[PDB]
């Protein structure tokens, strides 16, 4: 499922991501935008063999099991395929634990390089929030 800008914001807000760990909703929306262009089925193969899945491109090396990332962890205890669902529940829940790992949203390089320090609020303007 490919979300609309405002449709995803609402979806994320409704799922308790707004200001989660201090990150205003705009940060999460901005991140998703550059990570997957709002597509739950987005996937990218990393040079180390691991793979990033879903709207927030969660990596298999540490967070989910895809049976093809030798010597990795499954910290979120879920099949990586669950992060591709139209229901963003699994992605949101695993992200919530990722963003609590100490580095904040810096765990998402696209966020650090493209959202951090910007007016992320603009990502939720014109929306029904």
Q: Which residue in 7, 35, 66, 87 is the catalytic one?
A: 35
Write down the catalytic residue from 7, 18, 48, 52.
52
Tally of domains in the chain: 1
Phi first, then psi, for residue 109 (nearest 5°) are -55, -35
Active site residue 35: yes
SS3 of 65-76: ECCCCCCCCCCC
DSSP H or E run through 44: strand 43-45
Residues in Cβ contact with 84 at an 8 Å cutoff, skipping those fewer than 6 apart = 40, 41, 42, 43, 53, 54
Q: How would DSSP label each residue in 48-59?
A: TS-EEETTTTEE
Q: What is the resolution of this structure in A?
A: 2.1
Measured between alpha carbons, how far is residue 102 from residues 15, 96, 108, 122 in Å? 22, 12, 12, 26
Q: Is 101 annotated as a binding residue?
A: yes
Nearest of 25, 26, 3 to residue 16 by alpha carbon:
25
Residue 8 burial (CB count, 10 A): 25
Q: Which domain holds residue 1?
A: 1-129
7 is annotated as an active-site residue:
no
Separation of alpha carbons 95 and 76, rounded Å: 9
CATH of the domain at 39: 1.10.530.10
Cα 90 from Cα 96, distance rounded (Å): 10
């Amino acid at each position: 499922k490919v979300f609309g800008r405002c449709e995803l914001a609402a979806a994320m807000k409704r799922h308790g991501l707004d200001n989660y760990r201090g990150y205003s909703l705009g940060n999460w929306v901005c991140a998703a935008k550059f990570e997957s262009n709002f597509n739950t089925q987005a996937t990218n193969r990393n040079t180390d063999g691991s793979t990033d899945y879903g709207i927030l491109q969660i990596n298999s090396r540490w967070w989910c099991n895809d049976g093809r990332t030798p010597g990795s962890r499954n910290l979120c205890n879920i099949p990586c395929s669950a992060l591709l669902s139209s229901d963003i529940t699994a992605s949101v829940n695993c992200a919530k634990k990722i963003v609590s790992d100490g580095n904040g949203m810096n765990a998402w390089v696209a966020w650090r390089n493209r959202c951090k320090g910007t007016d992320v609020q603009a990502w939720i303007r014109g929306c029904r929030l």
